[PDB]
Amino acid sequence: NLKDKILGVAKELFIKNGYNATTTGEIVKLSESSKGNLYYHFKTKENLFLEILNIEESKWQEQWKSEQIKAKTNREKFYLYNELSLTTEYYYPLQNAIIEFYTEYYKTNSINEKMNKLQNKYIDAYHVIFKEGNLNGEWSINDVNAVSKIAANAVNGIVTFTHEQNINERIKLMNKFSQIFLNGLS
Template identity: 30%
Template sequence: MKKRKREGEQTKQRIADKAKELFSQKGYAATSMEEITEAAQTSKGNIYYHFKSKENLFLYLLEQSMMDWIEKWNMKSTAYSSAKEKLYGIAEHTALDFAGPLIKALEEFAGSQLADKLLLEKANEIGMLPLHSFRSVIEEGMASGEFKQGNVDEMTLILTGFMAGVGSYYHDLTQEELLALYKKSVDIMLYGMAAS
C-alpha cells in the first residue's frame, strides 16, 4: 500500500514538473492537456485522477511555487540581523521571484476570460501567501523599535502594494534595474521622499 501511494505521489509530481515546463515555455492557454499527457508519459485519466482540470493543475503549481518562495525566504531571512536588512532582503527575494518561470503564465491565467471566478479567487488567495512573511518583518521592526509603531495590517498592505507594484514592471526592466527599483521602494518606505 505504501509503495502504491509513493508511486502515486511520484506520478503526480512528474505531471506537475512537466506541466510547469510547458506552462513556462508556451504559456497557460497554449498548453494543452494532450501535451502535458505526452510530456509526463502518462494517460489523460491519470492526470485527471490527480488534478480535476488544467486550471486545478495550474493552481497546484502556483501554490507549490509560493510555498517554495516562503521556504527559501525563511532560510534567507536568518542571515539578516535587523528588520531593516530583512526588508531589503525580502524586496530582493521578491524581485528575483519575478524572474520565475510561471509569472507570464500566471498573468495569462489571471487575465483569462475562461477562468472560473472561484479559481481566480483561489489564485488570488495563493498569491497572498507571502503577506505573512511581509507582516513578520514589519512586526519585528516595530517590536525592535526600528520601525515606528503603527497599524501592522495597514503597513503589511502598503508593503505588499510596493512589492506588487514594482514587480509589475518586470517585463520592461532588466533584472539589475528591477532589483534597484525594489531597493529604492524600500528606501522610500523607510525614509520617505520628502526633502529633508
C-alpha cells in the same frame, strides 16, 4: 508517481510554452496518462497549475527562511525581501505562465479565491517583518495588516509593471522605493 509525473511534465510544458498554449493533451501524452486521469487528480488545467504554484510557493518560503538570516534587522529584511522578489521574478521560468494564468482568472471567483490564499503568504512575510520590527523599536506601525498589504501590492507593482529595463536600474528603483516607504513610516 503518476500524479507527480503529471505535475513535473506540466511544469516543464508551462515553462516551455506558457500557460495558455499548453494543452491537457500535451501534458497527458508526455506523462503517458489520459485526460480522464488528469481530470481525476486535478479536475482542470487551472487547478493543476495552482497545485504547481503551491509546491513552488512552499519552496520560495523555505528559501526566504534561510536567506533572511543574512539580514540582521527587520529594516534590512524589508529591503532584502523586496529585492529578492524583483530578482527572482526576473529569471523565474514559470513567471510568464503565472502572468497568463492570473490575467485570465483574476475575475474568476472560484480560482481567484485560491490565488488570494497564495498571495496572502507573501503578505504574511511582510507582517512578520513589520510586527517583529515594532517589537524591537525600528518603527511604530498601528495597522500592520494594512501596511503589509500596501507593501506587498506596491512592491509587486514595481516588479510587474516596470518596463524600464536594465536589471541594475530596476534594483536601484526598488531600493529607492524601500527607502521612501520605510521613511514614511517614521
